[PDB]
Symmetry: D4
Subunit: 215 residues, 8 copies
């Protein structure tokens, strides 16, 4: 099977949106978009889910040491070789107010992750090549009923409206594939941040078409 | 399904032993012990493969920034919740000569990893409980025909013969399940480090019993 | 007895306000609010006072290495197990001009301390559970006659008027208890920062009612 | 009242020795030696319990970030002013095999803690004087039936037999009071590390005399 | 003799102002203000000159590792015990544009140095007391003909006009002596930064009167 | 031969401008300006090319650890002794938006590199003197068709228009030679950043005249 | 031309051995082995001299921040692309007594440098492939008449006699070309460390054959 | 006058040896050897006293952040320009048991200090040349009656007997003046570490000749 690594945040993990903000559970394996993707691709492909809620591109979160994408990705890639493709959808969390990041800052973080994929040939002592990469801008954020979410994401929605533009620019420069998740879904979760069942479905269907086109 | 995370090194990844040391490839999904485990357990269980070649318990490898197990595990646990059990087989690489580690030092690195599992409840914003843990001592190393392997592992065999003892002590003290992989296999790969196909099969069949016993 | 840990700053320590700013002494044990609290609760409760003047939520003070709440709290919690409740009233010092912190920054620091309490089960090698937590916003600051206090707290009063809102939001999200000290007292100390005898009394009486409600 | 701070490790916390190593509970408030001290001294004195299990003098424990005594003490001193005396019994944990410390290294860690007490006058913005200090060598360790304790403390007993000598030397040189806990008790707990009830009582009655003698 | 340590920057070292900015030489020993001070005080006093050009209160200069006052002062004080008084005139260099420091930031740096003096009793193994301290605000900067000086000191003159106010506030709070050098001289050096012969004379005469008043 | 070290960025390396931004190749050895310089100088001189694309004066690039000029230059100078002259043309990359550097910041970085040259006498165990230095401001940037270049260089063109002024000021202060590359060429590369063949020629011819004048 | 980078220490720089230890000068361009290499290879090749005296494989020298080979090499590789071959002769300096390194430690430092060459494709934004690598063990050290050299290299000769073995093992394992400089020369310089003119010539003539053989 | 900087430890400060170890006082200005030096040299010279008790060559003391000689010296040199000669007597404290240093390690720390003097020309913005340096080995330690001194200096006497040899070697190699204090005095203070009055006098009279000889 052609092997697809899906590297991302809560949107990849499958965070179930709740009115009271948190805590929550995971979408069922056949509902979250990585599951929909695997179903839509069929047996000639394998999907590997590496989504961590609250994950950033490459910036340490001051409240949680687990969240820097770039600290984890190189070890993740070597762990899962042989790979054919890495889909990265990250940057939503970089727009949290407390990071004080501009869209350029966030694209630069994404550029680090693309470079980690591109330079990943061989892993630790193997003959395996580097997989391809697909850079995916998340859909823009939406209004948030929970006061804590409103606070931590102050200015975030505006920044997320820029990610498709800056990611497409970056990907064009680096000569890698790009897809805008916002072109196929809006962020419809009740919390204004996460996905509904339909968002997951529509995104999984769309990415399957991207995956077949690249591989 | 009940979800089983296999956290390990080349032995968990499935490094095929070769006469010329390196480079190599991965054992087939049905041949590496994580696959044999999955087969044996069946559809009521799901196995998650997080094996990284050259990984240590909790010590930075000066040649490669990817290899500190404790740097990665907390992020990995939160990525894969909900989890029922985490099998950890690590410690072989800690016995490389350049780490200058005693079996006690290695057991202490293992204690960090166990503590990371025991304290992992809720991950990022979830209602999920911590998984159980199973501490696994790898089998003792054997003589190595490749001079480079002989060099980096100088003194290592003697150290690996002590890991069942020190890990059993540790696990008893921490009141967590222990299993000695060396109770069912010896290290039979031609390089004196990695597993034969028959090593992988026997370890998988033994651990399948262990998993069913704990859950 | 049910055991209450009071973790805080000068307001918890019992700093006596003085016209010349500093140096000063501590309020008598039966006057400072932690003492009033203990008297009002009676023998079925025990109060443990961990107030350090100039303490912040989780930010190092450049003039004094002792002042980061989050650096100390985990060791403090393990020291005092068994515990039933931790009252944290901090954030006033985070509003000092030289920290350049917004109310969100300060709530994020408080979130770190709440997480330390929530994850504190077992301490070092015990069977003891985690205590509950009560997040307490301090009352807003007031005008300050001393020129040095005016300087270091420039912009501070405005920020302290926001802490009840941001702390309540945070606490709601994290599903922990919240109480606004500003709902029962104003900052009446002659220095514009610290408490009078009556402030201490009124706060101690109020928190006793909170403590009985939670335990 | 005259205020006595007891800064220590599990021996000061009141770890109940158990056959199975861990986990355990705290000796009752009237049974641990800090409580016996308080009883014996009476209402003219107040004892403050700052004992943290596994605490070292001034060395980071690689398994636990909470345990460096010197990281905590200056903050602790400033928290509890006004203080009349600080009793410090530490050094047992420094003799764990993985710290690779000599009795001299441990005495030097103790010298840091003494220096922190001697230089503590005024704390944060107060008129209060520095307390006196009493350097206490713990009693020598004994044979340990639990294999994990035997491992982590390998070589430790021999080191603890030297602490009265090196701490006496240190204290004489620094011109501060010294007391050897080993002059009145042996380590009689079933685990070979911690105290029996009779150990706690005798140590409390001896230190009560020491406290009255110094103040 | 009563021993006076003069801790400062180029203004204390005795930098000779030159039209071409730099390089330059030192004022003669009987012309620079520390020399004038020693002459005016007479044999009952001794002056010790510790002025380093480009020195800041407590901030590392990115172009020169030698320049952080607070990194050096504690070692300096212990070196020169017994001392009676420490005169600190610093803060001019903190106003360089590239430090992005406000007058409050600079007073906070000065507060660190005052604390180092106040806590300096005993040095390394001595019976000697702490000296007194005199906080001295430098005179305001003036127009600068050299384009490089204009650049590095952009915004500096305005900041230096605030130092007398913030230093006096600080000194009042900390209950230490303060003197404003700007009350007796203007910065008349041709470069707009350093002192003429007359500036040095007038300052030395003034400080002699301060020294006799304190000692 | 008199030996000239050319230390710089892509402009020194000889990056070929391309419409699609990147990747690209190097200008031929006799086309890039360091080659033109060597041809124009003749056999009495030797040119040593140390140009690294994306290099800054003295600031780490968050996407690439190779790029800090000042981290490399001291080792470079000792490597190439005996030297007669070091030409440094750097600062263009410092104007990338993500560095948030002002022209002063960039001149300060250049000042570090000049100091490294001036203090380089002897290298490692030699009798060789320090070479001279020539500070060279790059020509201003131009409009950039590629969206990624537009993004990373936002505000860059304006900053690069200031470098001749700030570098000349710096060089005047430090009493070293200065030349403005912008006085002889405009940035004509199709990407708005790099040089055409004619730019390289005109710059090489100009610098040859500078080199003969200094040596 | 095919481009050959010679990455090394004093032996590559061309340190002239002197009776009095230091200071010294560089062997003439036609006399050092890098020059003899260039002569022998002719105009179809170009040799690039990157030898730094006292350089180690990958360990910071506490007396000199310039000397960590691995700190510099990645920047150096990207500077000099396009490259066909990188010759690395390092490891002599790692055998200095104060580094406390074994031959294995040194081989591991060499493995870092090899890995930096193998992973260097594209440098900064180029289409260029990675060069090949040639691992070269230096010749064993000899007795040293200067007492300072005798001191710093105590135990070093014995270590250098092992480098051909461990580097051959390493290179075989990594599947990269190896050459032992000790197979063609002994260390004949009067200081027991550096090369005679005849040493330089023979090494150059041998490596010329090696270069032609690999390209 | 010609300016002589005396950079040292307690031996340069003038620690009065006492039976009870510590605390103590400073030898009178006319009795410490720096004073005897000044007397003997007369008014054509000026001596500058920079002796700090417990100072090491270049190693942080874990009990005291003030004691790394190399951290302070560059700042000290730039403070006291113009300088003609720097006398450095250090290395005794490096032989304390807890530093685990060999005579070679200590000589290397001394080499850092020498290098700091040799490279000190111009200080901050001056036209002044570097001073000369005189490397001085302290006299060997003697038996110590105080148990704390015996402990911290265990193995130290044997090390100090080697410093004249290793420092002579170092100085010869670096081509700088050397003098052995042990050629004229033995360590005769009652504590086995510090100097008698007659020790101070003889060292001063010998160094006075050395100073006149070098200038």
């Amino acid at each position: 099977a052609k092997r697809i690594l899906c590297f991302g945040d809560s949107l990849t993990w499958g965070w179930v949106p709740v009115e009271d903000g948190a805590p929550t559970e995971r979408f069922a394996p056949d509902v979250r978009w990585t599951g929909v993707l695997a179903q839509q691709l069929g047996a000639d492909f394998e999907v590997i889910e590496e989504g961590l809620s609250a994950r950033t591109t490459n910036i340490d979160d001051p409240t949680d040491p687990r969240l820097n994408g770039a600290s984890y990705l190189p070890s993740c890639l070597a762990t899962h070789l042989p790979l054919d493709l890495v889909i990265i959808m990250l940057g939503t969390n970089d727009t949290k107010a407390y990071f004080r990041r501009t869209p350029l800052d966030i694209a630069l973080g994404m550029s680090v992750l693309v470079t980690q994929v591109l330079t990943s040939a061989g892993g630790v002592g193997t003959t395996y090549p580097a997989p391809k990469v697909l850079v995916v801008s998340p859909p823009p954020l939406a209004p948030m009923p929970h006061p804590w979410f409103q606070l931590i994401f102050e200015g975030g929605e505006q920044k997320t409206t820029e990610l498709a533009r800056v990611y497409s620019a970056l990907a064009s420069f680096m000569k890698v594939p790009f897809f805008d998740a916002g072109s196929v879904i809006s962020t419809d979760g009740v919390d204004g941040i996460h996905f509904t069942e339909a968002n997951n479905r529509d995104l999984g269907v769309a990415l399957a078409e991207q995956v077949r086109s690249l591989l």
